[PDB]
Structure 1
Amino acid sequence: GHSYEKYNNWETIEAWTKQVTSENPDLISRTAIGTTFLGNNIYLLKVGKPGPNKPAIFMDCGFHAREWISHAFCQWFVREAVLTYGYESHMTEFLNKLDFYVLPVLNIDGYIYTWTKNRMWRKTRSTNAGTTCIGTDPNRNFDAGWCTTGASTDPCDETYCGSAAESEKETKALADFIRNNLSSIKAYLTIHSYSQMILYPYSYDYKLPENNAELNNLAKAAVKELATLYGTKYTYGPGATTIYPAAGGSDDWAYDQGIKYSFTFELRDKGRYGFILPESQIQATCEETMLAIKYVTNYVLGHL
């Protein structure tokens, strides 16, 4: 039984992708962009009313298995799109004019493992040469200063960069999807938790993107917007100096592909519950995050 106000296991979320697609055929279509290490389908939802030459925003959740509020958020975004389409002017305009690719869970194998065996697992569940230690950090696995700072070379470490950039089936599938759809994807959003932040490039070195001032202003206004609802305080800025250096990130990789609006979100909280954010915070967290995401979406729409 799926609920947007609880954490849903992978079987539930997978059935939800199919059902939400069936119930909303004018607004949603579903594809699989690849399969995981363990062979699970990586589903992707395309949310938007059909039309010609539509720009797109790409958003993924569930890079990191233990970050359950991330997975819940991508589901909430879809909830909002279908519920409010037609009644709320902004969401209606967004869906009419842009497509949203929502990838509800990238690291499906890790997610299953947090439900069955280890709530605090972060990495993929693939094997490594020369050791019994499992998995790669998918957010150290992209070809963006790959494996150079803030990433480990030890397969037993939580930030292990992998055997090569895109060595993981899941990160290969996401990078392939983005490469194949580069001319339409105008923004890349990647949802994580916790620590309450809106980050933009760069994390792989202490350097700033060409459109630094624009991304800084946008991130500042989006955090201001998020706080309107419950007063939740976010920080923002370039990854390396705002959270820590961390090479091989998907936001930096996406940005270096030419996608000018590339953000990583770090949802609630600031450490009281950390990864184990209680289900009773799902609603408030997703609602205030919707305000930031809609703010970014509206800006992208207005600055094509």
Structure 2
Amino acid sequence: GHSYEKYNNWETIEAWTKQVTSENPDLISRTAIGTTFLGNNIYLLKVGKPGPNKPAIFMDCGFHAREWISHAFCQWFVREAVLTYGYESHMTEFLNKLDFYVLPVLNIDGYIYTWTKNRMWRKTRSTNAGTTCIGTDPNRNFDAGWCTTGASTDPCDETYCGSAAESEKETKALADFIRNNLSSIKAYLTIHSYSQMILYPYSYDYKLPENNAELNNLAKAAVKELATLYGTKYTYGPGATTIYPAAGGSDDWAYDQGIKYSFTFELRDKGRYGFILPESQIQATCEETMLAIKYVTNYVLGHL
């Protein structure tokens, strides 16, 4: 069975996408935006009160297979949305005015592998020509200074950038969807772990985004909001100087598509458990993260 305070395998998450949609058709529509290398369905949930020409925020989880708290958060977010709509004034206004595109698990093949074989797998599970080595790092596979820094050209490496940008079916699927909906998507939020940070562009270069002052102020307020709940401390800043230079990430790519609010979230913790965050921290992690996401949403909406 599904549980929001446990990590769920893909079969269970998939069944959940169907069930939560069936139980809330007036707040959720489910589509598939492509298949993975191994033929799993890349679901996208459109969360919001349906209506014509609504702006949107796009959020994905599960880019990286071992970052299980990421997958957990997207599911947590969807429940909060459907349970509090109509009762909590902010979420009610959010869903009335915009849609959240929630992509609960991007790298499904890798996620399944962390359940079946290797908990610490990171990459996709696609084959590579001329080698037995498996997989591409999806967050090195976007057209953002592709493969120029912080990435490997070797398929046996954890940060393999791929044979070319969008060489992976999953990243191509995400990029295609975002490109087809640029008129509506106002923010891009991509959920990772761990490090307790909010990053904004750029990571592929030390250059700063034109609105970097605004992004810094926004990230600063979001981390302040997050801390109000349990005291959890986040830092923030441009990716390149705040964590490390790295090319081909989706946050940088989305920003260069014209999406002015683009953030990579790194959830708990700071390394004590690392990727293996206990299920006993799922609820607190998700609840505080919700405050940061809602703050950003409220800001983006108020500035349309």
TM-score, normalization by structure 2: 1.00
User: How far has the Cα of 1:246 moved from its partner?
Assistant: 0.9
Measure, in 2, the Cα distance between the counterparts of 1:124 and 1:200: 24
User: How far has the Cα of 1:53 moved from its partner?
Assistant: 1.5
Please state if 1:116 is matched with 2:116.
yes
Measure, in 2, the Cα distance between the counterparts of 1:155 and 1:45: 32
- The C-alpha deviation readout for 1:238-282, integer Å capped at 9, x for no partner, is 000001011000000000000000000000000000000000000
User: How far has the Cα of 1:50 moved from its partner?
Assistant: 1.0
- The C-alpha deviation readout for 1:52-73, integer Å capped at 9, x for no partner, is 2210000000000000000000
Measure, in 2, the Cα distance between the counterparts of 1:202 and 1:68: 25
For structure 1, the residue ranges without an aligned partner over 5 or more in a row are none
Alignment partner of 1:54: what SS?
Answer: coil
Measure, in 1, the Cα distance between the counterparts of 2:266 and 2:131: 32
Measure, in 1, the Cα distance between the counterparts of 2:266 and 2:278: 16
Partner of 1:225: 225
User: How far has the Cα of 1:8 moved from its partner?
Assistant: 0.3
Measure, in 1, the Cα distance between the counterparts of 2:21 and 2:220: 34
Measure, in 1, the Cα distance between the counterparts of 2:295 and 2:152: 35
User: How far has the Cα of 1:298 moved from its partner?
Assistant: 0.2
Partner of 2:35: 35
Measure, in 2, the Cα distance between the counterparts of 1:36 and 1:288: 31
Please state if 1:214 is matched with 2:214.
yes
Measure, in 1, the Cα distance between the counterparts of 2:17 and 2:61: 14
User: How far has the Cα of 1:51 moved from its partner?
Assistant: 1.7
User: How far has the Cα of 1:96 moved from its partner?
Assistant: 0.4
User: How far has the Cα of 1:129 moved from its partner?
Assistant: 1.3
Alignment partner of 1:275: what SS?
Answer: coil
User: How far has the Cα of 1:4 moved from its partner?
Assistant: 0.3
Alignment partner of 1:45: what SS?
Answer: strand
- The C-alpha deviation readout for 1:142-162, integer Å capped at 9, x for no partner, is 000000100111111100000
Seq. identity, %: 100
Measure, in 2, the Cα distance between the counterparts of 1:220 and 1:248: 25
- The C-alpha deviation readout for 1:83-112, integer Å capped at 9, x for no partner, is 111110000000000000000000000000
Measure, in 2, the Cα distance between the counterparts of 1:8 and 1:40: 16
Q: Deviating runs (4+, > 4 A) in structure 1? A: none
Partner of 1:277: 277
Q: How many residues align?
A: 304
- The C-alpha deviation readout for 1:104-153, integer Å capped at 9, x for no partner, is 00000000000000000000000111110000000000000000100111
Please give the root-mean-square deviation of Cα atoms over the aligned residues, in Å: 0.4
TM-score, normalization by structure 1: 1.00
For structure 2, the residue ranges without an aligned partner over 5 or more in a row are none
Alignment partner of 1:276: what SS?
Answer: coil
Measure, in 2, the Cα distance between the counterparts of 1:272 and 1:238: 24
